[PDB]
């Protein structure tokens, strides 16, 4: 109360010096440094550099010379100088650099658009790149709250660059209004005073990315709880109280430091107890939280102020058991820093376990009700074991989507198409096909998002799908009436029929199938679904009824049909790395409405929600989102009997957080498998990321992109001719070049190093002979500058050559195969490509439909390309190749290479699909045919797995792997063989192996049984034990085991 008062400068908010007249523009430079009076600093040395180019041309007399200082102010007053600037027209823009001498005062090349500011009278500030409509706007920005680069990281620490070595540094706070200079131009709100200090070790451990920040300390007795109830602003002033800066404050650090210990010990959601129903939501900053109860028809029937727990920041209320089945939301009164208002809105439960249609209301549910279980649910067992590393290694995954599975299948009842329940249609083509894949050794179905997505409208009246009349499309899609396809609104045919008609004159110059599908996408039922609305409710649109609990039992019914009828385990894709939206207004913003700025990751400076994932990046590094994630997985594990989880963008999570969720979930079922994908994240400055490298030895799997790229050819950024030039091992790199490629023998040999290493589990320490005949460890094989091998156990590696994202395997082969490769050869290229995965030691993963040569008509990113481009035809008429040019916005620069390559051979038909399916089941039956294929343990792999045909003189494209079951490896794991040879001859020539002469090698039984339909058809094992391999073939051979264990195929010490 003896304190210096922080205040604005004792001047009025400036008006405008001059308003531009006709064919003029005007620019003010607001001399804020000067208005902080003392010196009337002269403006002669101030000048404008001005020029025309092709974008902004409106200047009338540019002075192109850079060193000409002559463009000095037209005039000036106490707030600074201004410039009158002649122009050619009033519609356009002009380029401006602001200078003192030749020195830039604003580094950014400024541009003033006459579209934005129609009075072409604008203002700018030295050191700021923004262009304001008036000097008042600029003045208020300079002395107003801006950005959010202050971080209240624990109870008594504030990191803020803006306060560095200023004499006055304060935390201002206002419960009910936003902090602002009052009528006196003074900041009269309450404040805490901050004194300079040095960051803790514990704070630098928590926020390494902020450890260079100037630190400040809060009095030890500050009432933290009360400050976090409203707006908080950090302010810095000079010794006379004139404000230097004010910024908003990011509070997630202090929120964990104050509440997370207590709040972690509580359970959340609408919880059926024995004494009724307990509701609890975490809202440590909220002013009020009322529980609103809704009737079935969504009328308010009760509203309860909840009880705040002071230690946790959680709010709770207990009601009657009759509340089971009731709809509810939380009515929040809470300050949101993005809008700087105390907001009032109703939000669904982030811990919701049941919802109304389209997620508008959460719903009280007891998932343990036998009425939400199909008959026998409680005794449902894992058909495949996941205990030992060898168990895990046998995992053979079929990555599928709910509509991809059943949308086009006429043999699924119509009401079940695109539905969880399609999986119960035991006579359908789709289900019978999955049953046979299971019998042959596909072990796992992996589901694309079946949690509650945001992007499909669950109100069936608001949706039109291609099996329905075009008129319905025009009814629900207002853009169709004013499109080139409007005439079809009265046509009388379905949208699928119209798309069929559009194929005929579809081409790179008339991409009309795509053009119509783009509109169909906006309002169909189709999406991959990587758009989280609620993390722990099934998706509503995949139920026959999305209103209420029905989806819970239909979902479990599907889980039962997969494990029990189909005999496969079930993996869920999960997307904890982002939310669909944030802020206080978006319909699908849930977490960020209830605890604002806590669950999203924000830029350290502006406080904007980062979007590096695509969308609204979440903050799994914060304790209560880590809890939300683990609690969520727990429900999917226990109540839905999910056997494994695949994390989208896992490397946006801290390694420690993934490992913590894993230990928590292993406590419920120790056999649950975790894995994820990651290639992009640069969150390394904030924490140790859950990456391929950092996860060595943890037992968390990661998708490997090493064998993928090497066998497909190229990489995901390829476009244009590179898509054809970058051939892979599967499409003839080196051995069957196409007319565009320049791949050298050395490059092709490098691809074979990557593939072999992946077949041995992509281990860091696996020793192999490289392309030049040198000894190398896996970590020493280059993958675009990084260590290639990175795992400790093959169970940490998921191999694949096709997946839902990027082009299907078949479309890649169509891009890259030489013209002379005929259709039958392309089918074998598909099979040899998949043999490197299926016969490798890594866990085997594949896209639903590779066994049908699945195509997407070259679409590279089909997440919103509808039933049309994602079609899988289980009646086996074709593979959905050549059904139209793909989406132009993403594949348009590829139209030239598509048109060139597309019609090289005929489109696969029933004969090729059935042949591929046999190839596929052969490969999966081989993979599970001996324990040697799935050793599980890295040290065992290194002990037993070797390769022949290596070095600079290798026969290009021939992969020969040996797996030892003989004396030098230890126990005999397979009673019937002393060893196994895997020979993949991905080449146009027949090849002969002398490596095994004299050993009584013989072709495996499975392949001999397949006969002329085998991948090994035509293989010759001669008397002397030499082996002839046909072009484009896969052979699995074995050393038969005698009365006891033999010499097998010992690995050589290199
Ligand atoms: Ca103006
Ligand atoms: Ca949904
Ligand atoms: Ca869509
Ligand atoms: Ca044996
Ligand atoms: Mg960053």
PDB file of C-alpha atoms in Angstrom, residues 470 473-474 477-487 489 519 522:
ATOM      1  CA  UNK A 470     -29.473 -39.195 -55.141  1.00  0.00           C
ATOM      2  CA  UNK A 473     -28.242 -36.649 -51.134  1.00  0.00           C
ATOM      3  CA  UNK A 474     -29.637 -33.366 -52.460  1.00  0.00           C
ATOM      4  CA  UNK A 477     -26.370 -31.713 -48.795  1.00  0.00           C
ATOM      5  CA  UNK A 478     -27.228 -28.141 -49.744  1.00  0.00           C
ATOM      6  CA  UNK A 479     -24.090 -27.868 -51.895  1.00  0.00           C
ATOM      7  CA  UNK A 480     -25.339 -30.489 -54.374  1.00  0.00           C
ATOM      8  CA  UNK A 481     -28.187 -28.267 -55.638  1.00  0.00           C
ATOM      9  CA  UNK A 482     -25.616 -25.740 -56.927  1.00  0.00           C
ATOM     10  CA  UNK A 483     -23.073 -28.217 -58.270  1.00  0.00           C
ATOM     11  CA  UNK A 484     -22.384 -29.622 -61.710  1.00  0.00           C
ATOM     12  CA  UNK A 485     -24.395 -32.709 -60.596  1.00  0.00           C
ATOM     13  CA  UNK A 486     -27.645 -30.921 -59.719  1.00  0.00           C
ATOM     14  CA  UNK A 487     -29.563 -32.550 -62.582  1.00  0.00           C
ATOM     15  CA  UNK A 489     -31.459 -34.777 -57.967  1.00  0.00           C
ATOM     16  CA  UNK A 519     -19.663 -33.686 -51.929  1.00  0.00           C
ATOM     17  CA  UNK A 522     -19.292 -34.059 -46.435  1.00  0.00           C
TER      18      UNK A 522
END
